[PDB]
Design a binder for this molecule. Structure first.
Ligand SMILES: C[C@@H]1O[C@H](OP(=O)(O)OP(=O)(O)OC[C@H]2O[C@@H](n3cnc4c(=O)[nH]c(N)nc43)[C@H](O)[C@@H]2O)[C@@H](O)[C@H](O)[C@@H]1O
Ligand SMILES: *[C@@H]1O[C@H](CO)[C@@H](O)[C@H](O)[C@H]1NC(C)=O
Ligand SMILES: [Cl-]
Length: 389
């Protein structure tokens, strides 16, 4: 009716945890759009073109309902699930699809300017026309989706750089931004940002599972970890470093990249196990929870070196249920609540955890921490980004 719809997709290789960063980026834009007209973000169904990236078992068209808490998300910006977008608008039709791309001419130095232009497609377009002239595409796996018009947009700055073009230069009821990761954060550590990031609260069902785990195998519960909780994410502001954590060390070992001949910033199993023990003994920690994507061969090895290790291993049913990002989220949630945490270099999984601990109020010194390559000389820890309420 009175309102315009915003949709987006990201490059196919993008991970679950990155797609989450991009959502914040789009939020940033929408907010800016809402200052002028009536808009609503349409949540892109989870599940991915390269379906062999995820084990799952071929899981697709998953609604955000399964991962986050929608009412929570909505307190930040007006947001709706895709299946409902089809409900509201007549069919699964999109008026305009813009594919985002860099600038053909690239840039010399000095040439940095925020800007966006209609441009010829740098890369071969993936949308094909049907016998009816509609544009068929991947469309988050929704096979019947048809788009009305497709163009490319060269683009440079933050996400909101796009807003005017959408407001003035187009009439479309619904607009989709493909290759959205091309867009940058408006102002990253910003207060606008943190609003969005805090808005994404895990699906209740998921946290309950992690809380189950913490209570059972970790001797950890919210009260004993000195972390008061509040359902309304807005009503929860926390003096920094008040939250204690569970009597356990949280660790996230990101290993499936390693088939790379060499990477300076990831540790050997022995080398990492040494850090673990050093940490356990230092902070007087009893148990250690591990979130890891490791191969069975490597996990068996870890379990040898670290019998005291605890891991969350989902049953088939459990995974078919919570999907990949569901288990992913559980794994994160648990790490977030550990008294002290160490993650893997430049792993956007670990990044999300940093963000969670920073929301719970855990002292930063126990948050931003990373395993070092056995021989890597300059080993720079992750940057502390403080919440702004
Ligand atoms: C190298 C590139 O890195 C890019 O992200 P990259 O920084 O790895 O960082 P992540 O986004 O963590 O990539 C690992 C992905 O696999 C799953 N994953 C990784 N670690 C864990 C874990 O400990 N537990 C669970 N449940 N799941 C895990 C999760 O879905 C996560 O998004 C990727 O998007 C590209 O596909 C590519 O792989
Ligand atoms: C959009 O409209 C404005 C104002 O009418 C015009 O000046 C500008 O050239 C248009 N921009 C694009 C990218 O078409
Ligand atoms: Cl995904």
């Amino acid at each position: 009716s009175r309102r315009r719809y915003l949709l987006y997709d990201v490059n196919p290789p993008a991970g679950f945890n990155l797609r989450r960063d991009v959502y914040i980026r789009i939020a940033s834009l929408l907010k800016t759009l809402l200052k002028t007209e009536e808009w609503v973000l349409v949540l892109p169904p989870w599940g991915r073109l390269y379906h062999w990236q995820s084990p799952d078992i071929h899981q697709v068209r998953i609604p955000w309902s399964e991962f986050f808490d929608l009412p929570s998300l909505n307190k930040n910006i007006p947001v709706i699930e895709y299946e409902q977008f089809i409900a509201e608008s007549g069919g699964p039709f999109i008026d305009q699809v813009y594919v985002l791309q860099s600038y053909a001419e690239g840039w010399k130095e000095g040439t940095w300017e925020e800007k966006v232009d209609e441009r010829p497609c740098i890369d071969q377009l993936l949308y094909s026309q049907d016998k009816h002239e509609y544009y068929r595409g991947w469309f988050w796996g929704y096979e019947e989706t048809r788009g009305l018009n497709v163009s490319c947009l060269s683009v440079q700055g933050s996400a909101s750089i796009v807003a005017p073009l959408l407001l003035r230069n187009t009439s479309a009821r619904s607009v989709m931004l493909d290759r959205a990761e091309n867009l940058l954060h408006d102002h990253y550590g910003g207060k606008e940002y943190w609003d969005t990031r805090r808005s994404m609260v895990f699906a209740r069902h998921l946290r309950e599972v992690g809380d189950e785990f913490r209570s059972r195998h970790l001797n950890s519960t919210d009260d004993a970890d000195r972390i008061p909780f509040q359902e309304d994410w807005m009503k929860m502001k926390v003096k920094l470093g008040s939250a204690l954590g569970g009597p356990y060390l949280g660790v996230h070992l990101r290993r499936k990249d390693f088939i790379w001949g060499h990477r300076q910033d990831v540790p050997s199993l022995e080398g990492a196990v040494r850090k673990i023990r050093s940490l356990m003994k230092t902070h007087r920690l009893d148990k250690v929870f591990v979130a890891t994507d490791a191969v069975r061969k490597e996990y068996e090895e870890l379990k040898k070196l670290l019998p005291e290790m605890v891991r969350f291993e989902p049953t088939w049913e459990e995974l078919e249920l919570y999907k990949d990002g569901g288990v992913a989220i559980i794994d994160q949630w648990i790490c977030a609540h550990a008294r002290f945490f160490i993650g893997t270099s430049v792993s956007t999984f670990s990044f999300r955890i940093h963000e969670e601990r920073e929301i719970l109020g855990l002292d930063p010194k126990t948050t931003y921490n990373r395993f070092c390559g056995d021989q890597e000389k300059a080993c720079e820890q992750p940057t502390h980004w403080k919440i702004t309420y």
